[PDB]
Design a protein around this ligand. Sequence first.
Ligand SMILES: Nc1ncnc2c1ncn2[C@@H]1O[C@H](COP(=O)(O)OP(=O)(O)O)[C@@H](O)[C@H]1O
Ligand code: BEF
Ligand SMILES: [Mg+2]
Lengths: 82, 93, 91, 81, 106, 50, 98
Amino acid sequence: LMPQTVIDGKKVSGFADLDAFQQWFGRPKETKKTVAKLHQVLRPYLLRRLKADVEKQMPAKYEHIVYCKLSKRQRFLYDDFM
Amino acid sequence: RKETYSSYIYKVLKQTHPDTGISQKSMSILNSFVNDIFERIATEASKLAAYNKKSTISAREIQTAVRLILPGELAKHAVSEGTRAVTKYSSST
Amino acid sequence: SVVDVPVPSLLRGNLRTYQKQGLNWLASLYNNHTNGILADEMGLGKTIQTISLLAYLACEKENWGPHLIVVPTSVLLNWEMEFKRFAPGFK
Amino acid sequence: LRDNIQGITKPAIRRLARRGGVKRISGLIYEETRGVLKVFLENVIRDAVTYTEHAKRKTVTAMDVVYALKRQGRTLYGFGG
Amino acid sequence: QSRSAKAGLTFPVGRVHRLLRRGNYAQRIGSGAPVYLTAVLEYLAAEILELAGNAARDNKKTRIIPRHLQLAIRNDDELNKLLGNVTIAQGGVLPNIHQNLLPKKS
Amino acid sequence: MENTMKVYEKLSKAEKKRKIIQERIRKHKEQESQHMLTQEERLRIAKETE
Amino acid sequence: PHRYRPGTVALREIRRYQKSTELLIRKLPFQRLVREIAQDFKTDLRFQSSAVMALQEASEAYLVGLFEDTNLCAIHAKRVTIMPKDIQLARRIRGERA
Ligand SMILES: Nc1ncnc2c1ncn2[C@@H]1O[C@H](COP(=O)(O)OP(=O)(O)O)[C@@H](O)[C@H]1O
Ligand code: BEF
Ligand SMILES: [Mg+2]
């Protein structure tokens, strides 16, 4: 979004050094406050919206988990491989 | 540490033609042919010296090696220029 | 703050309210001369909002200049289709 | 290991001949060209390998290739040596 | 003062002497041999470079590239005779088409 | 010396043909630059494309 | 539909490829070939890219020289297509085959 740019033969930096960014945010309950500060930083650049708030037409989403037994051949190959 | 003829090649080229440049590929090719011709002349002079049983290579050895290696017209002008250079150096004493 | 910029006349179909809000926010970034990241929980109409932004650039700013969009291969044709659908005036 | 000599594509030979200015090529040329090429490479690489053995180094170098070519009576410029 | 200057030679006559001595080509080297060799090498370089530059200018280019250098060397019969066994990387080949291959009737 | 003569002649003929075609293309460029597009006609073209 | 006559594209590409300088044989297949050959000569010999590139240059030069010689030879037989006999004859007269 804000890269280093050359103007009139000179370089101008648009954004903080990656190392400084890592030092401030990446190094650290404090994680919640750091994430909140990150969100604050994004606030100019980022517009975030969620389906449930935006619309209520088709909320119906369902997730199911299926358990599968290994076939004798598959079981054998798995055991052998390990 | 190493050494190369590239500097002198650039110098002489500029003296012939200030506006023209050389890439490393061409520069290395030039260095290589200069090296090859130098080895050729030196080995010919070594042979001619050993054949006449002389231990000291000389202006004569190089003269005759250049006579042999270079084509006759190119040889004639090369020897002419070499003679001029040698005589001017000797006169510098 | 963000200004409720006029709806582009070139708009085909109905921008939903939230899509209008997103349009206005993009136009605000343009007026601020600032680049932006736009992340919607997928399936909200990012692409129609892109159309609406370009159309706002079209009506008010007259700037149909040669804009560039770089995109995965699969969605590319769908993008072409949606350009036809939402604003067929774009070459 | 499998067959690399066939791997040199027919278009490669065709374009090489194209540089040679030949109008048309009989199909049999491809096998003969491959044989000639392989023989040449065999000789050159043999010389390069023995040179590398003499150096005692495990890696062959451009210098070894230059010396191998020179021994064959072929001179290459630009790669040094 | 450098011996090159006293001779008036661009190439490093001293380095040439060093190479000839170290190069074990001969037991002894007369002081006239390095100056003669140096002058010869300088002359040859002068011609080849002149030809390369002329070729480059022909292309309307200004940096000598192996294409131009190859053209230069092969254009001169006697330089070809010297370099008849020399291959130039990226040298390419001369334009050569046989008259019998040209399209249509004469 | 003959190579230098050949290249010099080539350069001179190149220069003359160059300047002639330069005049031609400059006339074409100046005659093309005159064109301009108004918003209204741009819009109508848009409608046609619509 | 328009279609060039046999040999028109021939000459066209002759010109084109004669002009160009770029190396003609595909790099990776050549590298595989040379690696195999070296493995035949001695196992586990490492090759850096510069060495294979130089060898590929040399190979191209040798091949193109042979092609030139064979092209000159073939037309002497009044033909315009080279045949294997031209390859073996040229190679033998070169003193490579014998
Ligand atoms: N106002 C609208 N009327 C009808 N369909 C719409 C409207 N806005 C968006 N859509 C549908 O929403 C879909 C979202 O597609 P797309 O924008 O590519 O996904 P995302 O919003 O995740 O980027 C589109 O295919 C479009 O058909
Ligand atoms: F963000 Be989407 F669904 F392309
Ligand atoms: Mg999307």
